[PDB]
Write an enzyme that holds these catalytic residues in place. Structure first.
Site, PDB file in Angstrom:
ATOM      1  N   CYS A  98       0.830  -1.203   0.000  1.00 40.58           N
ATOM      2  CA  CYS A  98       0.000   0.000   0.000  1.00 40.58           C
ATOM      3  C   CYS A  98       0.867   1.258   0.000  1.00 40.58           C
ATOM      4  CB  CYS A  98      -0.939   0.023   1.206  1.00 40.58           C
ATOM      5  SG  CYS A  98      -1.923   1.517   1.247  1.00 40.58           S
ATOM      6  N   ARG A 105      -0.091   4.472   2.957  1.00 44.41           N
ATOM      7  CA  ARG A 105      -0.038   4.230   4.391  1.00 44.41           C
ATOM      8  C   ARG A 105       0.340   5.447   5.235  1.00 44.41           C
ATOM      9  NH1 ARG A 105       3.994  -0.543   4.693  1.00 44.41           N
ATOM     10  NH2 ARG A 105       4.315   0.049   2.488  1.00 44.41           N
ATOM     11  N   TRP A 134      -9.302   6.219  -0.522  1.00 47.80           N
ATOM     12  CA  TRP A 134      -9.609   6.963  -1.736  1.00 47.80           C
ATOM     13  C   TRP A 134      -8.607   6.556  -2.817  1.00 47.80           C
ATOM     14  CZ3 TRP A 134      -8.472   9.590   2.867  1.00 47.80           C
ATOM     15  CH2 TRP A 134      -7.157  10.056   3.002  1.00 47.80           C
ATOM     16  N   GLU A 174      -4.930   3.990 -10.640  1.00 46.83           N
ATOM     17  CA  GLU A 174      -5.753   2.803 -10.448  1.00 46.83           C
ATOM     18  C   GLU A 174      -6.951   2.804 -11.388  1.00 46.83           C
ATOM     19  OE1 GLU A 174      -6.225   1.480  -6.144  1.00 46.83           O
ATOM     20  OE2 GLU A 174      -5.901   3.649  -5.925  1.00 46.83           O
TER      21      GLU A 174
HETATM   22  C1  HEM Z   1      -6.393   6.288   2.005  1.00 46.76           C
HETATM   23  C2  HEM Z   1      -5.976   6.239   0.739  1.00 46.76           C
HETATM   24  C3  HEM Z   1      -5.358   4.961   0.129  1.00 46.76           C
HETATM   25  C4  HEM Z   1      -4.640   4.976  -0.975  1.00 46.76           C
HETATM   26  C5  HEM Z   1      -4.279   6.213  -1.838  1.00 46.76           C
HETATM   27  C6  HEM Z   1      -4.226   3.633  -1.250  1.00 46.76           C
HETATM   28  C7  HEM Z   1      -3.456   3.295  -2.329  1.00 46.76           C
HETATM   29  C8  HEM Z   1      -3.239   2.000  -2.683  1.00 46.76           C
HETATM   30  C9  HEM Z   1      -2.835   1.540  -3.998  1.00 46.76           C
HETATM   31  C10 HEM Z   1      -2.556   2.444  -5.218  1.00 46.76           C
HETATM   32  C11 HEM Z   1      -2.707   0.221  -3.927  1.00 46.76           C
HETATM   33  C12 HEM Z   1      -2.324  -0.694  -5.106  1.00 46.76           C
HETATM   34  C13 HEM Z   1      -3.716  -0.962  -5.679  1.00 46.76           C
HETATM   35  C14 HEM Z   1      -3.743  -1.936  -6.821  1.00 46.76           C
HETATM   36  O1  HEM Z   1      -2.859  -1.852  -7.722  1.00 46.76           O
HETATM   37  O2  HEM Z   1      -4.682  -2.778  -6.818  1.00 46.76           O
HETATM   38  C15 HEM Z   1      -3.069  -0.207  -2.581  1.00 46.76           C
HETATM   39  C16 HEM Z   1      -3.060  -1.491  -2.087  1.00 46.76           C
HETATM   40  C17 HEM Z   1      -3.434  -1.859  -0.809  1.00 46.76           C
HETATM   41  N1  HEM Z   1      -3.966  -1.037   0.180  1.00 46.76           N
HETATM   42 FE1  HEM Z   1      -3.999   0.932   0.114  1.00 46.76          FE
HETATM   43  N2  HEM Z   1      -4.705   2.791  -0.259  1.00 46.76           N
HETATM   44  C18 HEM Z   1      -5.431   3.589   0.608  1.00 46.76           C
HETATM   45  C19 HEM Z   1      -6.109   3.138   1.710  1.00 46.76           C
HETATM   46  C20 HEM Z   1      -6.011   1.890   2.266  1.00 46.76           C
HETATM   47  C21 HEM Z   1      -6.639   1.431   3.483  1.00 46.76           C
HETATM   48  C22 HEM Z   1      -7.600   2.321   4.303  1.00 46.76           C
HETATM   49  C23 HEM Z   1      -6.273   0.148   3.680  1.00 46.76           C
HETATM   50  C24 HEM Z   1      -6.593  -0.865   4.792  1.00 46.76           C
HETATM   51  C25 HEM Z   1      -7.081  -0.440   5.972  1.00 46.76           C
HETATM   52  C26 HEM Z   1      -5.393  -0.221   2.607  1.00 46.76           C
HETATM   53  C27 HEM Z   1      -4.787  -1.434   2.462  1.00 46.76           C
HETATM   54  C28 HEM Z   1      -4.233  -1.839   1.276  1.00 46.76           C
HETATM   55  C29 HEM Z   1      -3.829  -3.187   0.971  1.00 46.76           C
HETATM   56  C30 HEM Z   1      -3.913  -4.412   1.900  1.00 46.76           C
HETATM   57  C31 HEM Z   1      -3.356  -3.203  -0.275  1.00 46.76           C
HETATM   58  C32 HEM Z   1      -2.828  -4.468  -0.994  1.00 46.76           C
HETATM   59  C33 HEM Z   1      -3.992  -5.123  -1.732  1.00 46.76           C
HETATM   60  C34 HEM Z   1      -3.611  -6.360  -2.536  1.00 46.76           C
HETATM   61  O3  HEM Z   1      -2.487  -6.916  -2.368  1.00 46.76           O
HETATM   62  O4  HEM Z   1      -4.463  -6.821  -3.352  1.00 46.76           O
HETATM   63  N3  HEM Z   1      -5.265   0.859   1.767  1.00 46.76           N
HETATM   64  N4  HEM Z   1      -3.377   0.915  -1.849  1.00 46.76           N
HETATM   65  C1  LIG Z   2      -8.535   0.859   0.339  1.00 48.90           C
HETATM   66  C2  LIG Z   2      -7.949   1.065  -1.025  1.00 48.90           C
HETATM   67  C3  LIG Z   2      -7.740   2.325  -1.579  1.00 48.90           C
HETATM   68  C4  LIG Z   2      -7.187   2.415  -2.856  1.00 48.90           C
HETATM   69  N1  LIG Z   2      -6.974   3.612  -3.446  1.00 48.90           N
HETATM   70  N2  LIG Z   2      -6.865   1.290  -3.536  1.00 48.90           N
HETATM   71  C5  LIG Z   2      -7.030   0.075  -2.986  1.00 48.90           C
HETATM   72  C6  LIG Z   2      -6.622  -1.165  -3.720  1.00 48.90           C
HETATM   73  C7  LIG Z   2      -7.639  -1.493  -4.782  1.00 48.90           C
HETATM   74  C8  LIG Z   2      -7.795  -2.979  -5.033  1.00 48.90           C
HETATM   75  C9  LIG Z   2      -7.034  -4.040  -4.519  1.00 48.90           C
HETATM   76  F1  LIG Z   2      -5.995  -3.882  -3.685  1.00 48.90           F
HETATM   77  C10 LIG Z   2      -7.340  -5.348  -4.866  1.00 48.90           C
HETATM   78  F2  LIG Z   2      -6.616  -6.371  -4.371  1.00 48.90           F
HETATM   79  C11 LIG Z   2      -8.398  -5.612  -5.721  1.00 48.90           C
HETATM   80  C12 LIG Z   2      -9.147  -4.558  -6.220  1.00 48.90           C
HETATM   81  C13 LIG Z   2     -10.284  -4.860  -7.156  1.00 48.90           C
HETATM   82  C14 LIG Z   2      -9.691  -4.961  -8.558  1.00 48.90           C
HETATM   83  C15 LIG Z   2      -8.689  -3.844  -8.868  1.00 48.90           C
HETATM   84  N3  LIG Z   2      -8.908  -3.375 -10.229  1.00 48.90           N
HETATM   85  C16 LIG Z   2      -8.718  -4.550 -11.090  1.00 48.90           C
HETATM   86  C17 LIG Z   2     -10.281  -2.853 -10.312  1.00 48.90           C
HETATM   87  C18 LIG Z   2      -8.846  -3.252  -5.866  1.00 48.90           C
HETATM   88  F3  LIG Z   2      -9.555  -2.210  -6.352  1.00 48.90           F
HETATM   89  C19 LIG Z   2      -7.582  -0.066  -1.729  1.00 48.90           C
END
Ligand code: HEM
Ligand SMILES: Cc1cc(N)nc(CCc2c(F)c(F)cc(CCCN(C)C)c2F)c1
Ligand code: HEM
Ligand SMILES: Cc1cc(N)nc(CCc2c(F)c(F)cc(CCCN(C)C)c2F)c1
Ligand SMILES: C[C@H](O)[C@H](O)[C@H]1CNc2nc(N)[nH]c(=O)c2N1
Ligand SMILES: C[C@H](O)[C@H](O)[C@H]1CNc2nc(N)[nH]c(=O)c2N1
Ligand SMILES: [Zn+2]
Lengths: 408, 413
Positions: free
Chosen positions: B111, B114, B283, B288
């Site tokens: 993420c 964070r 958000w 994305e």
């Molecule tokens: C608040 C603004 C946030 C932003 C800008 C953000 C941004 C991102 C982005 C760009 C990714 C990669 C997404 C992808 O390529 O699918 C990601 C992954 C992730 N985020 Fe964040 N995130 C946010 C909030 C959160 C929150 C609130 C949580 C959990 C409480 C979280 C947990 C995770 C996790 C676990 C992943 C890995 C998901 C996976 O491996 O499929 N994120 N985030």
């Molecule tokens: C909390 C938060 C905020 C943010 N900005 N982004 C994320 C990650 C988004 C994300 C995942 F991590 C994931 F494992 C799977 C998906 C669905 C498919 C993704 N795409 C093919 C549509 C997904 F949307 C989470």
């Protein structure tokens, strides 16, 4: 165990058996992954390394366990005994050099690996000799713009006090100048090397695109300066197919990318001077060389002439200028018939290479961190390709910069 | 393992020192001989397995609140131990639940967002018993998190796993996603990524509108029962039509997207407890949507049509027509969200914030696990500061984990 890799765009799954043959370390453990860290002999150590390499050479020409194979093994055993080293056969040097490229997990260009011209320079004794060998390399590899991959192999390490070294990081690079008022003229990645050349007597023209001299070390002696004859240095003026003002930026680059600071390891022997060259992927020039903040750093000037709104990042003005710069580079090389590959074609070739290697070889070691291009990642196919990274030998390795070890 | 590991930034020369990796728990998938850093994915706990996992977590919690070794700490340990002994599980206190959820985010190496981890609104839904009640909790989550476009990060935590036959699950992969419909001729309408789940919904009774942007229904499983369908009230689904500041024709593509990204298929692990339904939302980073959702070949795949309207030569790849169209699409996505005052972050801002976050974590926590392959954005990677930043990846707990899709494991009643 066998290991599977999946391409998430195509759903193709490949099966890796080749990783079972690796023995060098990656740097990762079961608990910590170092995949984004850039860098994580004796008679006794030598013969098993020699044996493995001889074994895989004779296995590659399908005479494993032949009389030729048996005799070579004993020939190498006697020679390590009586000299603490051994010399490769010509056939082995060529095979070892092609396979070091084949095994280079960070190289997206490897579909070409078996088309490598290998220049044997192991009879070299002086920096003048090295310069001659290197001029011949540059002339051959440049080939009037129809670039040809090549490597020149200088004598192997003996006691570590008599190393052959090319002190340049690449054969052809531009100088960088530490300005009085703070900034940097030329290429900022080369400020230190440029100052070492000045300190050795090089008279710097203090331009923006000054080809650095060669600084060459033979048999552990002090290094000597040489000017590559300019008719050997092919360059490309960068212009844009739509922005007629792009040429007024005064930009150019050289056509020949030639790494000269790495170490080639073959059967336990270490070749500390092995300049090797191919042709450019356009992002290597247009993204990293021109647009890194610690490099030529020209994005602001280009975005200016495009009259883009540069007050907020979310206008993506940096991303817009980045694409146009890379369009210009590709257009310029192709217009001048200088070999170059765009990151879309290169990554497509690499996916096809991966498939080839999995079929005929049981795998292909690959470093996703390095294989994915520095722009437009996920619209290239390698972004979605799972890759297994592991260390196969023969290999190219990093080594210390010689100005940190050398006693004058 | 060595006690100090150094990471370097190759653009700035800054060197950071990691000691937090010593607290690493599960495995990365890598070995001394192979690195699996680009592999996407590399029956309950027994009493004996649960004791040490709980103590580790409780110890960490009391250490965080500067009460390590205190009477309340030793009492909590004893109370947990008795409860595991007599019931084979235990219940987290509200304070521990909130701490654990925030730290699972703080520990999420993939993420880039964070820097915000300590500002997470945690909704305790452990009293939920039915799918209707799950629906109510999720609606309140969506409404709170959307906040009329001023989005707030939040998580809703449903009851933990007991014997594995009574799981709470949200079958949706995200709370808000668009349907995809395979056509008889092989084309797909809507979002090709969601065809499998859309078909399951239709089989469960959903009447599909069969359009390009149909918000999928919630499919909710409580206490291991068969999942049930619910339509999210459309006034709770904030959406942004995509238009371009320069290209008037861009709005004629009829593209839009939803404002709230809300993962609902992951597992939250706290102290050896397993929260199989824990939807969380933040958000968006613009890429994305503009890079992955729109321009992946197996997704909406609009590069061609945008390039056509831009009148680009699409016969040589070396014209970089794809790269040029991808930028304009991402310009439009950011412009449209900012115009409608819906929170969104561009990839330059987010990666610069993450570097500042990572430096702070290294200084005050001893490290920051980070997955470079995921942290670097899918466009313009090397002109973002994360590209040049060496990162160490390791798994800390509490954590978010992947879990099997529930239709592959559910025992239908
Ligand atoms: C608040 C603004 C946030 C932003 C800008 C953000 C941004 C991102 C982005 C760009 C990714 C990669 C997404 C992808 O390529 O699918 C990601 C992954 C992730 N985020 Fe964040 N995130 C946010 C909030 C959160 C929150 C609130 C949580 C959990 C409480 C979280 C947990 C995770 C996790 C676990 C992943 C890995 C998901 C996976 O491996 O499929 N994120 N985030
Ligand atoms: C909390 C938060 C905020 C943010 N900005 N982004 C994320 C990650 C988004 C994300 C995942 F991590 C994931 F494992 C799977 C998906 C669905 C498919 C993704 N795409 C093919 C549509 C997904 F949307 C989470
Ligand atoms: C023929 C055309 C070639 C192309 C298009 C190509 C492409 C590339 C690119 C884009 C990189 C990443 C460079 C960087 O980011 O600094 C790379 C790395 C590398 N290439 Fe190739 N290459 C080619 C030929 C060769 C040859 C001929 C050799 C050796 C005989 C070679 C060995 C390597 C090695 C060892 C690396 C890793 C460098 C490192 O670890 O720092 N390449 N290649
Ligand atoms: C044979 C070949 C073909 C090809 N296309 N690219 C390469 C990689 C070139 C290369 C390195 F190998 C490396 F380690 C470091 C750099 C840094 C940039 C220095 N540059 C400003 C002068 C670099 F460019 C090799
Ligand atoms: C094969 C590779 O691991 C896969 O394509 C990954 C690469 N990095 C990623 N990074 C992010 N942020 N999101 C992703 O889905 C992926 N996919
Ligand atoms: C920190 C990271 O390892 C470093 O910036 C790497 C990332 N990937 C790269 N990939 C390529 N092709 N070239 C590079 O110099 C780098 N640098
Ligand atoms: Zn690894």
């Amino acid at each position: 165990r066998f290991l599977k890799v999946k391409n998430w765009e195509t759903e193709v799954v490949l099966t890796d058996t080749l990783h079972l043959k690796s023995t060098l370390e990656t740097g990762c453990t079961e608990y910590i992954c170092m995949g984004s860290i850039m860098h994580p002999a004796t008679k006794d150590q030598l013969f098993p390394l020699a044996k493995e390499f001889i074994d895989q050479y004779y296995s590659s020409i399908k005479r494993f366990g032949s009389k030729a194979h048996m005799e070579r093994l004993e020939e190498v055993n006697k020679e390590i005994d009586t000299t603490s080293t051994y010399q490769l056969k010509d056939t082995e040097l060529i095979y070892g050099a092609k396979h070091a490229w084949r095994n280079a997990s960070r190289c997206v260009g490897r579909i070409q690996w078996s088309k490598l011209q290998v220049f044997d320079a192991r009879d070299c004794t002086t920096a003048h000799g090295m310069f001659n060998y290197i001029c011949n390399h540059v002339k051959y590899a440049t080939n009037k713009g129809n670039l040809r991959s090549a490597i020149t192999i200088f004598p192997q390490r003996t006691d570590g006090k008599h190393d052959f070294r090319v002190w340049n990081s690449q054969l052809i690079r531009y100088a960088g100048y530490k300005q009085p008022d703070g900034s940097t003229l030329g290429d900022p990645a080369n400020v230190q090397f440029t100052e070492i050349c000045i300190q050795q007597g090089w008279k710097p023209p203090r331009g923006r695109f000054d080809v650095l001299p060669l600084l060459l070390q033979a048999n552990g002696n002090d290094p000597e300066l040489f000017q590559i004859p300019p008719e050997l240095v092919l360059e490309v003026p960068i212009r844009h197919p739509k922005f007629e003002w792009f040429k007024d930026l005064g930009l150019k680059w050289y056509g020949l990318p030639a790494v000269s600071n790495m170490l080639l390891e073959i059967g336990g022997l270490e070749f500390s001077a092995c300049p090797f060259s191919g042709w450019y992927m356009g992002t290597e020039i247009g993204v990293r060389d021109y647009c890194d903040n610690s490099r030529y750093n020209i994005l602001e000037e280009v975005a200016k002439k495009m009259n883009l709104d540069m007050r907020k990042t979310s206008s993506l003005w940096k991303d817009q200028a980045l694409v146009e710069i890379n369009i210009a580079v590709l257009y310029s090389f192709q217009s001048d018939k200088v070999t170059i590959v765009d990151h879309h074609s290169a990554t497509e070739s690499f996916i096809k290479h991966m498939e080839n290697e999995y079929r005929c070889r049981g795998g292909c070691p690959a470093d996703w961190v390095w294989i994915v291009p520095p722009m437009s990642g996920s619209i290239t196919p390698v972004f979605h390709q799972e890759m297994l990274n592991y260390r196969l030998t023969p290999s190219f390795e990093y080594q210390p910069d010689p100005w940190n070890t050398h006693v004058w």
